Design an enzyme around this catalytic site. Structure first.
Site, mmCIF file in Angstrom:
data_model
loop_
_atom_site.group_PDB
_atom_site.id
_atom_site.type_symbol
_atom_site.label_atom_id
_atom_site.label_comp_id
_atom_site.label_asym_id
_atom_site.label_seq_id
_atom_site.Cartn_x
_atom_site.Cartn_y
_atom_site.Cartn_z
ATOM 1 N N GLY A 54 0.799 -1.212 0.000
ATOM 2 C CA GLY A 54 0.000 0.000 0.000
ATOM 3 C C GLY A 54 0.833 1.263 0.000
ATOM 4 O O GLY A 54 0.525 2.204 0.743
ATOM 5 N N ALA A 60 1.771 5.259 4.305
ATOM 6 C CA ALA A 60 3.057 4.929 3.704
ATOM 7 C C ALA A 60 3.864 6.188 3.415
ATOM 8 O O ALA A 60 5.031 6.297 3.808
ATOM 9 C CB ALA A 60 2.845 4.114 2.428
ATOM 10 N N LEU A 73 3.805 2.519 22.035
ATOM 11 C CA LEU A 73 4.677 1.667 22.827
ATOM 12 C C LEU A 73 6.144 1.782 22.429
ATOM 13 O O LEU A 73 7.005 1.200 23.100
ATOM 14 C CB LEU A 73 4.188 0.221 22.732
ATOM 15 N N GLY A 74 6.447 2.513 21.359
ATOM 16 C CA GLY A 74 7.780 3.000 21.085
ATOM 17 C C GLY A 74 8.059 4.363 21.672
ATOM 18 O O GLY A 74 9.133 4.928 21.440
ATOM 19 N N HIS A 80 -4.625 2.229 23.017
ATOM 20 C CA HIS A 80 -3.520 3.021 23.553
ATOM 21 C C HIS A 80 -3.518 3.029 25.078
ATOM 22 O O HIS A 80 -2.553 2.585 25.710
ATOM 23 C CB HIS A 80 -3.585 4.454 23.014
ATOM 24 N N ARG A 95 4.069 12.732 31.468
ATOM 25 C CA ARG A 95 3.513 13.344 30.271
ATOM 26 C C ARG A 95 4.324 12.921 29.054
ATOM 27 O O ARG A 95 5.546 12.767 29.134
ATOM 28 C CB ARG A 95 3.489 14.873 30.378
HETATM 29 N N1 LIG Z 1 -3.467 7.531 7.897
HETATM 30 C C1 LIG Z 1 -3.254 7.597 9.303
HETATM 31 O O1 LIG Z 1 -2.907 8.644 9.816
HETATM 32 C C2 LIG Z 1 -3.455 6.365 10.157
HETATM 33 C C3 LIG Z 1 -3.640 5.051 9.475
HETATM 34 N N2 LIG Z 1 -3.649 3.816 10.192
HETATM 35 C C4 LIG Z 1 -4.215 2.583 9.573
HETATM 36 O O2 LIG Z 1 -3.194 1.991 8.492
HETATM 37 C C5 LIG Z 1 -3.868 1.545 7.481
HETATM 38 C C6 LIG Z 1 -3.418 2.299 6.142
HETATM 39 O O3 LIG Z 1 -3.518 3.741 6.321
HETATM 40 P P1 LIG Z 1 -4.264 4.616 5.134
HETATM 41 O O4 LIG Z 1 -3.295 4.875 4.033
HETATM 42 O O5 LIG Z 1 -4.735 5.901 5.684
HETATM 43 O O6 LIG Z 1 -5.570 3.738 4.553
HETATM 44 P P2 LIG Z 1 -6.096 3.796 2.983
HETATM 45 O O7 LIG Z 1 -7.585 3.640 2.956
HETATM 46 O O8 LIG Z 1 -5.728 5.090 2.377
HETATM 47 O O9 LIG Z 1 -5.391 2.544 2.127
HETATM 48 C C7 LIG Z 1 -4.004 2.582 1.914
HETATM 49 C C8 LIG Z 1 -3.674 2.021 0.533
HETATM 50 O O10 LIG Z 1 -4.001 0.759 0.472
HETATM 51 C C9 LIG Z 1 -4.921 0.557 -0.818
HETATM 52 N N3 LIG Z 1 -6.304 0.419 -0.412
HETATM 53 C C10 LIG Z 1 -7.275 1.117 0.193
HETATM 54 N N4 LIG Z 1 -8.372 0.346 0.248
HETATM 55 C C11 LIG Z 1 -8.078 -0.836 -0.327
HETATM 56 C C12 LIG Z 1 -8.830 -1.973 -0.536
HETATM 57 N N5 LIG Z 1 -10.197 -2.380 -0.245
HETATM 58 N N6 LIG Z 1 -8.287 -3.026 -1.142
HETATM 59 C C13 LIG Z 1 -6.999 -2.981 -1.553
HETATM 60 N N7 LIG Z 1 -6.259 -1.863 -1.349
HETATM 61 C C14 LIG Z 1 -6.804 -0.792 -0.735
HETATM 62 C C15 LIG Z 1 -4.769 1.653 -1.563
HETATM 63 O O11 LIG Z 1 -3.556 1.529 -2.447
HETATM 64 P P3 LIG Z 1 -3.716 0.806 -3.945
HETATM 65 O O12 LIG Z 1 -5.045 1.141 -4.515
HETATM 66 O O13 LIG Z 1 -2.622 1.322 -4.875
HETATM 67 O O14 LIG Z 1 -3.588 -0.664 -3.797
HETATM 68 C C16 LIG Z 1 -4.531 2.738 -0.553
HETATM 69 O O15 LIG Z 1 -3.820 3.778 -1.125
HETATM 70 C C17 LIG Z 1 -5.345 1.817 7.803
HETATM 71 O O16 LIG Z 1 -5.951 0.633 8.237
HETATM 72 C C18 LIG Z 1 -5.320 2.833 8.932
HETATM 73 O O17 LIG Z 1 -6.517 2.616 9.857
HETATM 74 C C19 LIG Z 1 -3.094 3.744 11.532
HETATM 75 C C20 LIG Z 1 -2.711 5.040 12.300
HETATM 76 C C21 LIG Z 1 -2.990 6.436 11.662
#
Ligand SMILES: NC(=O)C1=CN([C@@H]2O[C@H](COP(=O)(O)OP(=O)(O)OC[C@H]3O[C@@H](n4cnc5c(N)ncnc54)[C@H](OP(=O)(O)O)[C@@H]3O)[C@@H](O)[C@H]2O)C=CC1
Ligand SMILES: NC(=O)C1=CN([C@@H]2O[C@H](COP(=O)(O)OP(=O)(O)OC[C@H]3O[C@@H](n4cnc5c(N)ncnc54)[C@H](OP(=O)(O)O)[C@@H]3O)[C@@H](O)[C@H]2O)C=CC1
Ligand SMILES: O=P(O)(O)OC[C@H]1O[C@@H](O)[C@H](O)[C@@H](O)[C@@H]1O
Lengths: 528, 527
Positions: free
Chosen positions: B55, B61, B229-230, B289, B415
């Site tokens: 992803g 990412a 936890l880091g 958390h 804190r």
């Molecule tokens: N963004 C944040 O600040 C936070 C995110 N997280 C968690 O990490 C995970 C990823 O973060 P985030 O980028 O925001 O989530 P996204 O919904 O943006 O998905 C990330 C990437 O994975 C692919 N994607 C999305 N949905 C699907 C799907 N059904 N099937 C296949 N690929 C999919 C897409 O890439 P492509 O289409 O190229 O395959 C997308 O760009 C999430 O579960 C989120 O809850 C945890 C802490 C904070």
């Protein structure tokens, strides 16, 4: 202006205590201290019930050195601070005949007042409160004229309350105390219409259990314990009074203040100075009688005493005597003496090189000893008392080492430490071990840090104010003094009988190497 | 020759200047930046490792993962021949334009390491493919192995770390294709998989997902990441508790009167109400958390500093926590702020009308064991509140005698956000002349170990700890299950409408039902 570069004289004052703490080159430490160091200069400059009664302070032996050098200067700083009533009358009592008493006040006294002399000439208004009385210490008749002069100042009071309060200061050798109190009792007691009498007694309070018990019995028929104020030049220091508060106002420190948490307690008294040409009469006292039997024992009593049942003066003193009665007398195998010789570079002459000391005498200028307090709270805890003159550093502090938590971190952690320093700089910090703030590693990467806490007259002037206020908390009681002597007298007799003799050590050293070996052999651990 | 060597850095200078314009706000700041950069610079191992970020097109990412690996690169915590492959389904046409702009513009610092970023991006490659395609993973494993076998070192093959920056609905298929298409080179090497935030929404949902991944990876390879936890100060929670006798002796019910773990944010839902409405504040920051922080605070002494000994103890103490019921919890849902700056939660277009989703929650947990019997553990979390604050409040039992009203309860405060701190509040006598032994004031003795300089983020430990194979700061399978059992019955009761949130406008501390609940559960207020 021209050549005025005291910034060089300024800069090393900042430096002197960056070597004292050496905390991980914290740029805040250099900064946050600097403005507080300057605002020391930014903060300095020139009761509602003590006014109610006339007060007379009678300083016996006004011709003496202690009277002229700190006793009268002590009352001077209390006056400028507003801690004396406006109509206070100070009378100096001595045998020496002086005429032109204003010359005596303005020359032989005005030589030794405070450094605030240039900050303000309130002393000229202070010296108008000072009178001189020439007489004898064993003359009942002379004290009746002293009472007459005092009554002419008590009856000069402009308030409505009758009588007057009399504080007698015995800046005299202890051999004169008994006759002075008898003369006061027969000739100069306060007026029957109102007023109290308090007598301040200076050290030495005897030299052993029998010697001191006779002195207290010689003063018994004249003044009780509520009137006798045996002064201690260290019980007025602010951190040693703070010992009570942190122990008993905080559950954190109280729960770990016992034998089940503490590994070793060390109370050390260090001076870089020797007797310095005036050791002839320190030779008959010794380091033990000078600062160990009285000062460090007082600190030990507050450190190990049980919780007082109230914050009243005699509740705290009751606990001090009760814990001191749990201490076995010190034996000769639990003591190492020392006598300082000439410095390696020749800066400080040796103790025996003094003209006034009888050469060949075995008087100790250094002593480290272990005390045992046999009660539930302190059973097995080694209490180390250390005192020496002409040593590597000037230091008066308490070091409390808590027992190591061994199993979880092993060699990655060490003993916790609680340190209370009173001189030169006040401090209290708790040394523990935390995880290094760098990275993760094996979680065994640790370093010992410390937990430093954030924050008018001196200690000597606090006790005089305490006596004027009637607070006997920081003055040693008669029963308290006897128990302290019984702890030290059997050892002191062995010192005089030569059963243990001092080990020579050069001036500027930490002391004899046998002392540090003794310290490490009695539960003390050092990390560097 | 040298001609191309002097135009790649000119692009390297550009890629630093290009980074900020897409962040901030025009042409003059590029100029004023350029004169900042002039003397900004001018002042003076074992195996092959492959890090595959699934992803890569996702926000996490680009925003937090790739900047993390970048910061560890300059910290020198990766092998010199590390390989980073971005895996995603979306098309990218320009090979380097994606790397040099959409990932470098989330890097830091801009000026003093921007050229180090250019060499970092030379370790990054992009792979476009599907998460359920065996052929694509066989293609991915081919290029992985053919950079593993070009590595120069004594051992063979290489190690592979997989980062699943994907929605949790894709984890099962991603791990299946890895197991049969991209396992480590059989000559030697390990595989480790990082699982991101949403591990289910209750015990049953989480049990199925963890059961969907066990047939491919065991707990030694599964690294469920919690970016708390880091943290510097919750990872020290272990050290001060057990490496110091002073703190260990008072860490029990006979010295502690109340424990409060609090999470506060000034921000609201921020126009994303459709995706927070189905989660709730409990599932977002409290079930994961604060419970993790609770485990470290309340866990028994580990038998050693080994990873699974610490995790075992934090698992064991969570098993003593009874499931939270509705009467030990107060909920809140934030409305429009007084000044009108932050719109109300229901004012979001994406929020369904009449929603009872809680944006605020305070609850008490009871730890029924010898150490913590009777000690109230209060967990508080809320959005759009008076301040941003993440802290622990340990109030020790007040000793009334002999000081009475001259002293109060001791407090130990940890804190972590916005600024990390650690201080113990105590009462000492005021430095004063006629202020006698009864005259006291509350002072503190703080964790005054700062350094010369002063800064990695919480992730950079977690990826590094995954790279070192520690796994102490990652949620285990059993740990996640027991934590869900504590909160799930309460979550179902809210889902059934038994509990409905109390409104509170944005910017307040929350409803007074929360403050009444806190004050009624062992907390005391001094001034
Ligand atoms: N963004 C944040 O600040 C936070 C995110 N997280 C968690 O990490 C995970 C990823 O973060 P985030 O980028 O925001 O989530 P996204 O919904 O943006 O998905 C990330 C990437 O994975 C692919 N994607 C999305 N949905 C699907 C799907 N059904 N099937 C296949 N690929 C999919 C897409 O890439 P492509 O289409 O190229 O395959 C997308 O760009 C999430 O579960 C989120 O809850 C945890 C802490 C904070
Ligand atoms: N000042 C210091 O640094 C120290 C002080 N002390 C203690 O403070 C107390 C007073 O200090 P200090 O002034 O130095 O002591 P002194 O020996 O100097 O005596 C003080 C005054 O009392 C009179 N005096 C001296 N000897 C006798 C005597 N046998 N009989 C009657 N009067 C005598 C003298 O006044 P006059 O002839 O006019 O009557 C003398 O000026 C002492 O008891 C001492 O133990 C303890 C440690 C250090
Ligand atoms: O939870 P948040 O808001 O993302 O905060 C996490 C970051 O907060 C910072 O204060 C820390 O320095 C980082 O270690 C950490 O990554």
């Amino acid at each position: 202006d021209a050549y005025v570069a005291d910034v060089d004289g300024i800069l090393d004052v900042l430096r002197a205590q960056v070597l004292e703490r050496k905390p991980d080159d914290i740029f805040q430490f250099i900064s946050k201290s600097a403005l507080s160091l300057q605002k020391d200069r930014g903060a300095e400059s020139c009761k509602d019930e003590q006014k109610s009664r006339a007060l007379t302070i009678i300083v016996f032996g006004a011709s003496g050195d202690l009277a002229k050098k700190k006793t009268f200067p002590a009352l001077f700083d209390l006056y400028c601070g507003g801690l004396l009533p406006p109509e206070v009358n100070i009378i100096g009592y001595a045998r020496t005949k002086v005429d032109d008493v204003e010359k005596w006040k303005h020359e032989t006294l005005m030589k030794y007042f405070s450094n605030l002399s240039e900050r303000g000439s309130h002393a000229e208004d202070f010296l108008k409160h000072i009178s001189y009385f020439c007489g004898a210490y064993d003359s009942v008749d002379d004290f009746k004229r002293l009472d007459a002069v005092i009554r002419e100042k008590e009856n000069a009071f402009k308030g409505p309350e009758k009588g007057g309060n009399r504080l007698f200061y015995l800046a005299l050798p202890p051999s004169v105390f008994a006759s002075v109190c008898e003369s006061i009792h027969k000739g100069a007691m306060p007026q029957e219409v109102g007023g109290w009498v308090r007598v301040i007694i200076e050290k030495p309070f005897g030299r052993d259990t029998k010697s001191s018990a006779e002195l207290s019995q010689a003063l018994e028929p004249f003044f009780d314990e509520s009137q006798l104020y045996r002064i201690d030049h260290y019980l007025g220091k602010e951190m040693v009074q703070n010992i009570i508060t942190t122990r008993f106002a905080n559950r954190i420190f109280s729960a770990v203040w016992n034998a089940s948490n503490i590994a070793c307690v060390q109370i050390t008294f260090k001076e870089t100075i020797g007797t310095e040409g005036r050791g002839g009469y320190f030779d008959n006292i010794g380091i033990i009688r000078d600062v160990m039997q009285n000062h460090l024992t007082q600190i030990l009593a507050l450190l190990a005493m049980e919780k007082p049942r109230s914050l009243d003066a005699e509740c705290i003193r009751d606990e001090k005597v009760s814990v001191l009665k749990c201490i076995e007398p010190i034996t000769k195998e639990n003591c190492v003496l020392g006598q300082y010789t000439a410095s390696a570079d020749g800066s400080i002459p040796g103790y025996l090189e003094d003209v006034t000391v009888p050469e060949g005498s075995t008087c100790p200028t250094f002593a480290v000893m272990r005390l045992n307090i046999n009660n539930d709270r302190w059973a097995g805890v080694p209490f180390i008392l250390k005192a020496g003159k002409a040593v590597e550093q000037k230091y008066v502090a308490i070091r409390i080492q808590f027992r190591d938590e061994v199993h979880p971190y092993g060699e990655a952690t060490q003993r916790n430490e609680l340190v209370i320093r009173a001189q030169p700089s006040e401090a209290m910090y708790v040394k523990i071990t935390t995880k290094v703030p760098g990275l993760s590693g094996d979680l065994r990467q640790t370093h010992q840090t410390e937990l430093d806490l954030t924050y008018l007259p001196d200690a000597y002037e606090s006790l005089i104010n305490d006596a004027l206020l009637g607070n006997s908390t920081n003055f040693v009681r008669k029963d308290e003094l006897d128990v302290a002597w019984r702890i030290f007298t059997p050892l002191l007799h062995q010192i005089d009988s030569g059963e243990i003799k001092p080990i020579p050590y050069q001036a500027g050293t930490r002391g004899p190497k046998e002392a540090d070996e003794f310290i490490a052999n009695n539960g003390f651990k050092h990390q560097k």
